[PDB]
Amino acid sequence: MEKTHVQLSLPVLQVRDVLVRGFGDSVEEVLSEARQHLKDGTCGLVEVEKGVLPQLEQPYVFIKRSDARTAPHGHVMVELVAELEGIQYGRSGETLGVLVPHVGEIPVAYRKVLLRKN
């Protein structure tokens, strides 16, 4: 049974390595696909810097920090927020990065998160 939060270690990818640059073609689809790939262990994380988002495909899926005191066991608590045409779907804290499919690219680090399911 699905707990409200799940501990995940996400591979951190450099933007130029990413082969599949988004999760789909609408806000609802990208959130759905991101959640599926997170469950399947096939989701990467790109840290946002200048030039990153223009090299990825909208709609974007961000992981954002969802509280201040609780980083259990080393895993920062996060939730998903999508963006399309400058409008965001969810309100949350600071961005940890943008999620993308992972298809075997070599990461530069792993990021521990405690992900809110829905």
Tab-separated table of C-alpha atoms in Angstrom:
chain	number	residue	atom	x	y	z
A	1	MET	CA	0.000	0.000	0.000
A	2	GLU	CA	1.151	3.488	-0.998
A	3	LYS	CA	2.536	5.470	1.911
A	4	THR	CA	2.106	9.219	1.808
A	5	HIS	CA	5.867	9.648	1.361
A	6	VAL	CA	8.623	7.445	-0.052
A	7	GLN	CA	12.397	7.641	0.339
A	8	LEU	CA	14.176	7.734	-3.034
A	9	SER	CA	17.762	8.338	-4.192
A	10	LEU	CA	17.564	10.090	-7.556
A	11	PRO	CA	20.392	10.162	-10.120
A	12	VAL	CA	21.490	13.742	-10.833
A	13	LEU	CA	22.082	14.248	-14.570
A	14	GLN	CA	23.826	16.983	-16.510
A	15	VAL	CA	21.463	18.619	-18.961
A	16	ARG	CA	23.571	17.891	-22.059
A	17	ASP	CA	23.510	14.149	-21.285
A	18	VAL	CA	19.712	13.850	-21.075
A	19	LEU	CA	18.242	11.815	-23.917
A	20	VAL	CA	14.498	12.230	-23.160
A	21	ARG	CA	14.027	15.873	-22.257
A	22	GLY	CA	10.585	15.751	-20.613
A	23	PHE	CA	7.688	13.550	-19.661
A	24	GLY	CA	5.024	14.491	-22.164
A	25	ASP	CA	2.767	17.095	-23.646
A	26	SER	CA	0.365	18.380	-20.954
A	27	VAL	CA	0.528	19.204	-17.261
A	28	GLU	CA	-1.533	16.168	-16.271
A	29	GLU	CA	0.539	13.829	-18.434
A	30	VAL	CA	3.905	15.057	-17.182
A	31	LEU	CA	2.871	14.736	-13.546
A	32	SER	CA	1.473	11.246	-14.184
A	33	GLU	CA	4.552	10.067	-16.069
A	34	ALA	CA	6.933	11.590	-13.529
A	35	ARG	CA	5.128	9.736	-10.733
A	36	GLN	CA	5.272	6.462	-12.664
A	37	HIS	CA	9.003	6.831	-13.432
A	38	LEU	CA	9.670	7.701	-9.800
A	39	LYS	CA	7.952	4.449	-8.751
A	40	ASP	CA	9.865	2.443	-11.383
A	41	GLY	CA	13.270	3.867	-10.499
A	42	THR	CA	13.629	5.453	-13.933
A	43	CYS	CA	13.548	9.163	-13.018
A	44	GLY	CA	16.508	11.551	-13.043
A	45	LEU	CA	16.987	15.053	-11.617
A	46	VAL	CA	18.663	18.023	-13.376
A	47	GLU	CA	19.773	20.906	-11.121
A	48	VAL	CA	18.486	24.223	-12.520
A	49	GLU	CA	21.168	26.728	-13.593
A	50	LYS	CA	21.153	29.371	-16.323
A	51	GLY	CA	20.547	27.715	-19.700
A	52	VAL	CA	19.022	24.499	-18.319
A	53	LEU	CA	15.287	25.015	-18.778
A	54	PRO	CA	15.622	26.238	-22.409
A	55	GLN	CA	17.397	22.932	-23.172
A	56	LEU	CA	14.514	20.897	-21.716
A	57	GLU	CA	10.925	20.445	-22.906
A	58	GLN	CA	7.793	21.955	-21.428
A	59	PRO	CA	5.704	21.244	-19.515
A	60	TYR	CA	8.358	20.959	-16.801
A	61	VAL	CA	8.095	18.876	-13.611
A	62	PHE	CA	9.926	20.342	-10.619
A	63	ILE	CA	10.619	18.818	-7.243
A	64	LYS	CA	10.263	21.483	-4.557
A	65	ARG	CA	10.978	21.465	-0.848
A	66	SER	CA	7.788	20.933	1.090
A	67	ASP	CA	8.760	21.809	4.708
A	68	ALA	CA	11.557	23.192	6.899
A	69	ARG	CA	12.194	20.892	9.852
A	70	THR	CA	11.909	17.366	8.486
A	71	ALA	CA	14.838	15.869	6.566
A	72	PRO	CA	14.388	12.351	7.950
A	73	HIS	CA	17.318	9.962	7.633
A	74	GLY	CA	18.958	12.479	5.271
A	75	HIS	CA	16.106	12.732	2.728
A	76	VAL	CA	14.655	16.213	2.146
A	77	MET	CA	10.872	16.255	1.944
A	78	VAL	CA	9.640	17.272	-1.528
A	79	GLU	CA	6.561	17.490	-3.726
A	80	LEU	CA	5.912	17.756	-7.453
A	81	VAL	CA	4.936	21.016	-9.193
A	82	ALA	CA	4.476	21.368	-12.958
A	83	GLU	CA	4.980	24.459	-15.131
A	84	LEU	CA	3.640	25.313	-18.572
A	85	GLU	CA	3.804	28.704	-20.300
A	86	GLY	CA	4.851	30.419	-17.107
A	87	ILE	CA	1.975	29.069	-15.000
A	88	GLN	CA	2.612	26.654	-12.148
A	89	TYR	CA	0.391	23.815	-10.995
A	90	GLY	CA	1.042	23.386	-7.242
A	91	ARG	CA	2.561	25.866	-4.739
A	92	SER	CA	5.576	24.763	-2.667
A	93	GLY	CA	9.044	25.756	-1.482
A	94	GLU	CA	12.456	25.987	-3.125
A	95	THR	CA	13.299	23.988	-6.283
A	96	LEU	CA	15.748	21.085	-5.976
A	97	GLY	CA	15.675	20.459	-9.707
A	98	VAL	CA	13.711	19.453	-12.774
A	99	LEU	CA	12.749	15.783	-13.237
A	100	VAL	CA	13.377	13.919	-16.498
A	101	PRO	CA	13.182	10.302	-17.601
A	102	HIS	CA	16.340	8.326	-16.832
A	103	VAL	CA	17.325	5.937	-19.634
A	104	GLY	CA	20.787	4.883	-18.455
A	105	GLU	CA	22.726	8.161	-18.524
A	106	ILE	CA	25.652	8.336	-16.099
A	107	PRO	CA	24.854	10.637	-13.159
A	108	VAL	CA	27.168	13.058	-11.387
A	109	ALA	CA	25.628	12.485	-7.913
A	110	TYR	CA	22.603	10.958	-6.200
A	111	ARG	CA	20.059	13.155	-4.364
A	112	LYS	CA	18.108	11.696	-1.454
A	113	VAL	CA	14.473	12.857	-1.212
A	114	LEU	CA	11.344	11.986	0.758
A	115	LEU	CA	8.749	12.344	-1.980
A	116	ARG	CA	5.107	13.145	-1.334
A	117	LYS	CA	2.920	10.708	-3.278
A	118	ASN	CA	0.052	12.910	-4.492
